């Protein structure tokens, strides 16, 4: 099967791009994961997760101000378009982010813990013990892979020489270098649990279909 | 009711039985060669 995956874009831009659904079909052509297909057409907004990325030929902590916090089909959380310097980025927003707010993004580990606003991005070591974080990264300068879903809080547990132990939402710990950049707060779209979809048609709209088999 | 399984279409007919589709795989070249040997004057659809 001539299946060139759609995820072929290289340059970054805030404009939505044209998703092509898969239906569970992998590159060969066979149902690899049952229960996928159909549903509303969607476009993809390239949300950028390295929340500490300085613009071209600049450095040092930077401030950005939001513009809007809109629905996103692909995520479960609500993305936000942050403007800074001469650059716009899509970033996952936390619960209490309104249009017009401002957020700091720093890699500067202070002498001691700096009381951080509930949307800013700081290195793990820079935060105090007992706060809530999102968009954690496994290792520095990599990107956010851990907590990103809707309404998920990640507690910071402790710090030791060069590392920090954080608690993931699944009720278990993990170690990460203290220079890993996280965001303090709770991911947006809280109480997304309580979405009684009501009827099978909604499931079909989202993209799921009922599949018997799954040998 | 059955019997009308052939809904003709030139694009499909030329795509799934044509000269280039045969020549795009060893099995197809074998098919063309069999039909060259048997004498056919309709090698490819």
């Amino acid at each position: 099967a001539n299946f060139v995956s759609w995820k072929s874009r290289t340059k970054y831009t805030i404009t939505p791009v044209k998703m092509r659904k898969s239906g569970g079909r992998d590159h060969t052509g066979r149902i690899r994961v049952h229960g996928i297909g159909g549903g509303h057409k969607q476009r993809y907004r390239m949300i950028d997760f390295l929340r500490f990325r300085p613009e071209e030929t600049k450095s040092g902590p930077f401030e950005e101000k939001v513009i809007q916090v809109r629905y996103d089909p692909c995520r479960s959380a609500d993305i936000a378009l942050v403007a800074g310097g001469s650059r716009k980025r899509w970033i996952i927003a936390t619960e209490n982010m309104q249009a017009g707010d401002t957020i700091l993004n720093s890699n500067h580990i202070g002498r001691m813990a700096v009381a951080a606003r509930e949307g800013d991005a700081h290195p793990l070591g820079a935060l105090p013990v007992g706060t809530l974080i999102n968009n954690v990264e496994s290792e520095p300068g990599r990107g956010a892979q851990y907590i990103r879903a809707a309404g998920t809080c990640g507690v910071l547990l402790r710090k030791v020489n060069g590392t920090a132990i954080i608690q993931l939402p699944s009720k278990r710990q993990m170690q990460v270098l203290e220079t890993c950049v996280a965001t303090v707060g709770r991911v947006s779209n809280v109480d997304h649990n309580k979405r009684v979809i009501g009827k099978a048609g909604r499931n079909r709209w989202l993209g799921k279909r009922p599949n018997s088999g799954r040998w | 009711a059955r019997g009308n399984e052939y809904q003709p279409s030139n694009i499909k007919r030329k795509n799934k039985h044509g000269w280039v589709r045969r020549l795009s795989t060893p099995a197809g070249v074998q098919v063309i060669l069999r039909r060259m040997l048997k004498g056919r004057k309709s090698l490819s659809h």
Binding site: - | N10, I11, K41, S42, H45
Partner: protein
């Protein structure tokens, strides 16, 4: 479901009906928006001579002598083309007698053929 009859431009859907030519040469190229540009150079300009005063006709009288078939061969052409000049100049280094060593700087190349009948 017919595979014996020839395949020509009258057969497929719109796309096929358009793409397939009918043996006709091209004279130009498609530009943007399906606009066609013609090139005066790719259109064969016929070269017809002046037939006035010509003393030959489509046929030849039945009162003509016969002869033998003697096809022109490279030797026969060379014999009366350049040889006499050689012999005349043999009584006292080849391009002077019509030899053309290379065929890039002439309009009608002999091999490959860059001209037309």
């Amino acid at each position: 479901a017919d595979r014996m009859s020839k395949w020509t431009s009258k057969r497929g859907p719109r796309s096929f009906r358009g793409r397939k030519g009918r043996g006709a040469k091209g004279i130009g190229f498609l530009t943007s928006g399906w606009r066609f540009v013609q090139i005066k150079e790719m259109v064969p300009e016929f070269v017809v001579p002046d037939l006035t005063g010509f003393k030959l006709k489509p046929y030849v009288s039945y009162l003509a002598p016969e002869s033998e078939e003697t096809p022109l061969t490279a030797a026969q052409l060379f014999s009366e083309a350049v040889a006499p000049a050689i012999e005349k100049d043999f009584k006292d280094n080849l391009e002077k007698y019509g030899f053309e060593p290379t065929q890039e700087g002439k309009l009608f190349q002999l091999y490959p053929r860059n001209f037309l009948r």
